[PDB]
Design a binder for this molecule. Structure first.
Ligand code: B12
Ligand SMILES: CN1c2c(nc(N)[nH]c2=O)NC[C@@H]1CNc1ccc(C(=O)N[C@@H](CCC(=O)O)C(=O)O)cc1
Ligand SMILES: [K+]
Ligand SMILES: [Zn+2]
Ligand SMILES: [Zn+2]
Length: 867
């Protein structure tokens, strides 16, 4: 049945025990194979609590981690102190944890590189797995092979796909040899990282010859999204077409804020559902490090989750212990598990939100104007490398009704891939709506899927060049969990008659559903839109042929969608004529079964707004209604050359607001195109350079900080705003009157032992873009080296960062060092576990120490202290 195009390793085929088939998630068939999933049907399995906050309780020294170089790495304890890891496992098993997690989340090349252990991930993964079996096999319990998100965000360009894929592949080998009962991807922050890690571990399954179940889990930030800005609706929509088995949450902030999120996963997911909150964020109660979630409260949460919502697996994360799991194992034993929903509503998604493929009484509209062949303006800015101009175009089609966007960079004598690699990093975070990737090259689609988050659409697969290319693209759409446009062209040519369209649509449907295991709701069948208006005879019945096929295939293929490029029906006509025929063809298509269209969104006219004599002649064209004498094409052109404004459109003045308000809205909305012209307009009108910085520019920067903190703006849009502010400062900097000085300088560094840099490098970017000089010394920096930089650079303040409670004690040591060396200058501490209370405690050592919750407080503090 297969051809050389086929590749059913990652996604799975339509036969056997593949994760997805034509009727959705394989629930009954996969349970038979995997005893973990078999038990989820029958009973709520209990997971372990934390590994790391247990390891921190122990009296651990540098020699226990094999020396000073690796002090604080959890993964080396599988080699250097295996019994300490086992001790914890055994204590959860005695509390009643039917599943435990291998101490292997940080076991990745690029994370392990920071301890000089880059070559060692497969090793440390193997050892942590073996330890876990030796505990679990005595107690008759399952082992889950934990893998974490790393230190480097792929959507924002901190690591490539290829390296991130390399790391998850080798770490999964290590687990699969060690004999894990499932792979578990956890604490995910970046929806593209999820897809990368899922495909990786599915390949490592194909290499070692053993297939285990897949459990993927995200963390939400307090604001209510993932770090990179993905909501729960989008996260789920991305996971529901991937080869996974369980979806869920871990860590985050506690059960309080996780509640509505797990309510969503529980209601809609056709997969099983996991849920593992931490004990909330730690505090310091007179020396001792305290968590506020009691075990009695965690039982009263997991009872609600398991018995009201229908959550299958329950457990804990950072700052829970054996006492938490004890009370959880009690509360859930003998509850009858609710069966998971049978089908899932078809949707796609961007980085940030999901979109239904069925729109009620309406259409999924795909803006057509990012097409090099089909838009002079796009073509020009593509070749001129005008990034701002392309985002203005893309942004513009959204404002007019675009649910998604079509992207086509192909042009004679250009490299399609070179242009794609420039563009897609920017689009991946720029766009607020999903992409449809338009290409005849399977390698162009492949590249695109390594860059674009969410769930995507591929345009198209057909049988033009045989079964190779068809199967190639169909496997690709199965793996990345993308929707597939199916065009009706076979090896003998384009399908012109209705009988030709059905035959071809029927055969492809059969390859995709039965062979490749695709759902109907994944397919959008494109029958052909040919130009009926060019002049020729044979071409007259061709829009009719297509509408009649589509109403036949709607009845014969219940689940499917249909897509058309309706702007091709009108070729060989004037702009204004084209608009009207396209608006009418679109409406008759909806009636016959069309669910989706490729259109210029803002040039769709409602049927109410079309002249009636024009409307009826449009019908006469579309359905081939031709009397002797009466030529409906001539009368249709006659009409437009007579009636002057029959389809005229001006759209203007969206930003025609007050000048100072416009400048501020430029920062908040992140719009740089036109920025410098407006800033000049303001200077000519008497506005002083330094008044514009501290007036409308600073106000929109406070507003950007106000919205982000409340969950009303996402992280990439915050980096956009600062970019607008950067350009603004560069423009007005030459013209200012009290010249001679900068705003201020901050030496910044993560502390000795602290490996994570995402939030340090956000503070760098945000402060530098606002014209603060930032000497970023990197990670693990000793205090001796910090004060060398200070003595050289004469900064206005010192900033220290680190994620953990041990980071906070190192900062206390650094203040004791700085006090005794005689330093008096301002220090600014921040960090994920660092609280406001603990810094006020530290003021007894060093008076001029301040606390930052985020980089916008650093903003505030830098302003305040520099003057
Ligand atoms: C996902 C996550 C991770 C990621 C971190 C990804 C990264 N940042 O690179 C991973 C999984 C890798 C990680 C690891 C661990 N985790 Co963790 N993790 C989290 C989490 C959810 C925070 C997520 C995060 O990245 N936020 C986003 C970043 C951008 O925010 P940020 O770091 O806070 O930075 C911001 C501000 O603090 C501020 N800022 C930071 N520094 C500075 C400096 C200055 C000068 C200024 C002005 C501002 C400033 O600006 C930033 C943006 O505005 C928290 C819980 C929570 N909700 O906070 C736990 C948390 C940090 N993790 C914790 C733990 C226990 C661990 C591990 C030890 C677990 C283990 N299995 O052993 C390991 C670390 C091991 C090691 N090698 O050292 C604890 C720490 C407490 C403790 N020690 O008891 C927390 C608080 C969870 C808890 N107990 O409730 N973690
Ligand atoms: C055949 N097409 C098509 C497809 N994708 C699918 N699935 N099906 C199709 O039928 N992709 C490309 C095209 C649909 N897209 C387009 C895009 C623009 C114009 C168009 O009419 N462009 C104008 C120029 C506009 C300008 O430059 O301002 C033209 O005159 O060609 C037509 C179709
Ligand atoms: K756990
Ligand atoms: Zn095949
Ligand atoms: Zn945690």
């Amino acid at each position: 049945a297969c051809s050389p195009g086929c590749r059913h390793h990652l996604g799975g085929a339509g036969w056997g025990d593949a994760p997805l088939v034509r009727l959705g998630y394989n629930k009954e068939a996969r349970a038979k194979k995997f005893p973990y999933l078999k038990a989820l049907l029958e009973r709520p399995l209990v997971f372990d609590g934390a590994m790391g906050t247990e390891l921190q309780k122990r009296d651990l020294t540098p020699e226990d981690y094999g020396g000073e170089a690796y002090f604080g790495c959890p993964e080396v304890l599988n080699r250097t102190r295996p019994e300490v890891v086992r001790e914890i496992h055994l204590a959860y098993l005695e509390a009643g944890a039917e599943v435990i997690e291998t101490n292997t989340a940080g076991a990745l090349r690029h994370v392990l590189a920071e301890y000089g252990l880059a070559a060692a991930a497969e090793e440390l993964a193997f050892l942590g797995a073996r330890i876990a079996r030796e505990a679990a096999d005595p107690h008759g319990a399952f082992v889950a092979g934990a893998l974490g998100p790393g230190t480097k965000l792929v959507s924002l360009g901190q690591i490539s796909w290829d390296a991130l894929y390399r790391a998850y592949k080798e770490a999964a080998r290590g687990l699969l040899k060690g004999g894990v009962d499932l792979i578990l991807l956890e604490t995910a922050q970046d929806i593209l990282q999820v897809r990368c890690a899922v495909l990786a571990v599915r390949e490592a399954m194909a290499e070692v010859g053993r297939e285990v179940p897949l459990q993927v889990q995200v963390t939400f930030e307090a604001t209510g999204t993932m770090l990179v800005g993905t909501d729960e609706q989008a996260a789920l929509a991305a996971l529901e077409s991937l080869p996974v088995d369980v979806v869920g949450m871990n860590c985050a902030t506690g059960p309080d804020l996780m509640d509505s999120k797990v309510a969503y996963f529980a209601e809609h997911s056709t997969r099983f559902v996991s849920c593992l909150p931490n004990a909330g964020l730690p505090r310091n109660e007179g020396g001792r490090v305290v968590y506020d979630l009691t075990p009695e409260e965690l039982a009263k949460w997991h009872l609600k989750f398991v018995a009201e919502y229908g959550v299958n697996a329950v457990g804990g994360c950072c700052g829970t212990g054996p006492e938490h799991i004890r009370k959880v194992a009690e509360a859930v034993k003998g509850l009858a598990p609710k069966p998971r929903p049978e089908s899932f509503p078809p949707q796609v998604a961007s980085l940030y939100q999901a979109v239904s493929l069925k729109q009620e009484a309406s259409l999924f509209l795909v803006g057509e104007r990012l097409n090099a062949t089909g838009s002079k303006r796009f073509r020009e800015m593509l070749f001129a490398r005008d990034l701002e101009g392309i985002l203005a175009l893309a942004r513009e089609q959204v404002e007019e009704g675009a649910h998604a966007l079509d992207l086509s960079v192909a042009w004679t004598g250009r490299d399609e891939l070179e242009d794609l690699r420039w563009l897609l990093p920017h689009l991946a975070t720029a766009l607020t709506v999903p992409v449809m990737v338009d290409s005849t090259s399977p390698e162009a689609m492949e590249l695109a899927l390594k860059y674009l988050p969410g769930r995507v659409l591929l345009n198209s697969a057909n049988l033009e060049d045989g079964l190779e290319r068809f199967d190639r693209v169909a496997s690709l759409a199965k793996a990345h969990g993308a929707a597939l446009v199916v065009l009706a062209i076979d090896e003998k040519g384009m399908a012109k008659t209705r009988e030709e369209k059905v035959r071809v649509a029927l055969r492809m449907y059969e390859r995709l559903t039965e062979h490749h295991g695709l759902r109907p709701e994944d397919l959008l069948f494109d029958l052909l839109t040919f130009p009926i208006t060019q002049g020729d005879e044979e071409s007259r019945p061709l829009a009719k042929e297509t509408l009649l096929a589509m109403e036949e295939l709607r009845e014969r293929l219940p689940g499917v969608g249909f897509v058309l490029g309706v702007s091709n029906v009108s070729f060989g006509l004037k702009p204004r004529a084209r608009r009207v025929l396209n608006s009418v063809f679109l409406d008759e298509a909806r009636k016959r079964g069309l669910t989706a269209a490729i259109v210029d969104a803002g040039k769709i006219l409602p049927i109410s707004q079309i002249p009636e004599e024009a409307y009826a002649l449009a019908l006469d064209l579309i359905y081939d209604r031709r009397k002797e004498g009466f030529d409906p094409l001539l009368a249709f052109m006659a009409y437009f050359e007579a009636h002057k404004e029959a389809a005229a459109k001006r759209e203007d003045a969206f930003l025609a607001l007050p000048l100072l308000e416009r400048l501020k809205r430029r920062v908040v909305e992140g719009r740089k195109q036109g920025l410098e012209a407006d800033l000049e307009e303001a200077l000519k009108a008497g506005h002083k350079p330094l008044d514009l910085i501290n007036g409308p520019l600073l106000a929109g920067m406070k507003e950007v900080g106000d919205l982000f903190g409340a969950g009303k703006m996402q992280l990439p849009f915050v980096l956009q705003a600062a970019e607008v502010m950067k350009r603004a400062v560069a423009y007005l900097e030459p013209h200012m009157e009290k010249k001679g000085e900068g705003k201020g300088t901050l030496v910044l560094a993560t502390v000795k032992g602290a490996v994570h840099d995402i939030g340090k490098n956000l503070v760098d970017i945000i402060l530098s873009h606002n014209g603060y000089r930032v000497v970023n010394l990197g990670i693990k920096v000793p205090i001796e080296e910090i004060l060398k930089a200070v003595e050289a650079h004469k900064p206005h303040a010192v900033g220290m960062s680190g994620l953990l409670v041990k980071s906070t004690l190192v900062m206390k040591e650094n203040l004791e060092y700085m006090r005794d060396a005689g330093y008096t200058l301002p220090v600014i501490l921040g960090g994920a576990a660092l609280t406001r209370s603990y810094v006020e405690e530290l003021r007894a050592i060093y008076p001029n120490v301040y606390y930052a919750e985020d980089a916008f407080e650093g903003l505030r503090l830098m302003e305040e202290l520099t003057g």
